[PDB]
Scaffold this active site. Structure first.
Site, short mmCIF file in Angstrom:
data_model
loop_
_atom_site.label_atom_id
_atom_site.label_comp_id
_atom_site.label_asym_id
_atom_site.label_seq_id
_atom_site.Cartn_x
_atom_site.Cartn_y
_atom_site.Cartn_z
N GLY A 26 -18.63 14.41 30.78
CA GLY A 26 -19.53 14.66 29.67
C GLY A 26 -19.20 15.97 28.99
O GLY A 26 -18.34 16.73 29.43
N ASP A 138 -7.96 23.21 42.00
CA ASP A 138 -7.64 22.94 40.60
C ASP A 138 -7.80 24.20 39.77
O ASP A 138 -8.32 24.17 38.65
CB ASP A 138 -8.50 21.80 40.03
CG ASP A 138 -7.90 21.19 38.77
OD1 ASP A 138 -6.67 21.32 38.58
OD2 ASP A 138 -8.65 20.57 37.99
#
Ligand SMILES: *[C@H]1C[C@H](C)OC(=O)c2c(O)cc(O)cc2OCC[C@H](O)[C@H](O)C(=O)[C@@H]1F
Length: 337
Positions: A26, A138
């Site tokens: 989102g 990450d």
């Protein structure tokens, strides 16, 4: 409900929304917090159709609600419907930052003082993460947020995992989820990315990118990433090859022509020599020889900031989608009236 580009249903506490960017599931908006009378950031998440999305959302919420650290963005509030039947989306409210390091590096050259301070804060946050036995997995410029006074916070624990070094070994060329340009070489050779050295490599890539405003290893597909790394580090030593017991991985490396190391001060002629010394130790091919986070903090490049008493560690270290939605519902209950 207020709408942006999409239902962004955060009222009535949060009003006057502005589009910022994108999360995994989102968009990200800025909004006015009518209770605290300050603008905040809000990320919308819609994970409940897919199991893997529920995994990523739940584990991030679990991690961020336990973590408390100046260089890790915290969760101020979580917005969702009062019942499992009615909740389709989840909204995460966090501090409003000014920019992310990816956008900053697109147009701004960093002074050595900024590079030093940014690197210090990354490693300070990472010390806390690793002290909780957690791997971020990450780290990259777009996941590092900066406020207007250049305070830095690590964001997105979407791919984080508990460290598992005894189960890190895998075959040659097995798939990996994290972003390609920041992948350590052993990911493509024999590692599942389950040890802390995977994060130090990414930080080394970020340091190199702060020095020149361009990614150091911009590989364009899976094995090309290794081409780029070896093109700068040069061929691995016999000792480092012997540490790779997997025959497919070792014989691939043995099949390559010899490559010379490119000196760091040739790649970064403007860089501080102490920064390049730390860069070399973070971008070490052999993960067992790679510098660890606490050693990196004590490196001479970071002398003006290093203070172990002010570099805190964690107090408490660390399925069908329908069970996961229920767990996400339960994990977010503390923010309900
Ligand atoms: C984490 C997502 C959080 C919500 O991002 C922010 O808080 C945030 C912010 O406060 C200011 C600016 O300018 C950007 C921003 O997020 C940008 C998105 C970011 O690059 C990642 O995609 C994330 O989702 C982030 F790690």
């Amino acid at each position: 409900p207020e709408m942006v580009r999409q239902v962004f249903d955060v009222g009535p506490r949060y009003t006057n929304l502005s589009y910022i960017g994108e999360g995994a599931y989102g968009m990200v908006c800025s909004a006015y917090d009518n209770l605290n009378k300050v603008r905040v950031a809000i990320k919308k998440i819609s994970p409940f159709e897919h199991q893997t999305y529920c995994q990523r959302t739940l584990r991030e919420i679990k991690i961020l609600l336990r973590f408390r650290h100046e260089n890790i963005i915290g969760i101020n509030d979580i917005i969702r419907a009062p019942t499992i039947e009615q909740m389709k989306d989840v909204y995460i409210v966090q501090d409003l930052m000014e920019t992310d390091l990816y956008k900053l590096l697109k147009t701004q050259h960093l002074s050595n003082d900024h590079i030093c301070y940014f690197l210090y804060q990354i490693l300070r946050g990472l010390k806390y993460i690793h002290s909780a036995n957690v791997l971020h997995r990450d780290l990259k410029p777009s996941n590092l947020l900066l406020n207007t006074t250049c305070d830095l916070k690590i964001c997105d624990f979407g791919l984080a995992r508990v460290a598992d070094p005894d189960h890190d070994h895998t075959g040659f060329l097995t798939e990996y989820v994290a972003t390609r340009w920041y992948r350590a070489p052993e990911i493509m050779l024999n590692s599942k990315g389950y040890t802390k050295s995977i994060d130090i490599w990414s930080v080394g890539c970020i340091l190199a990118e702060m020095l020149s405003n361009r990614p150091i290893f911009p590989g364009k597909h899976y094995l090309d990433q290794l081409n780029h790394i070896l093109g700068i580090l040069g061929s691995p030593s016999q000792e480092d090859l012997n540490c790779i017991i997997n025959l497919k991985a070792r014989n691939y490396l043995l099949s390559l022509p010899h490559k010379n190391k490119v000196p760091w001060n040739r790649l970064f002629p403007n860089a501080d020599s102490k920064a390049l010394d730390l860069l070399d130790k973070m971008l070490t091919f052999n993960p067992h020889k790679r510098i660890e986070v606490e050693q990196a903090l004590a490196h001479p490049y970071l002398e003006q900031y290093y203070d172990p008493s002010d570099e805190p560690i964690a107090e408490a270290p660390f399925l069908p989608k329908e069970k996961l939605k229920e767990l996400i519902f339960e994990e977010t209950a503390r923010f309900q009236p």
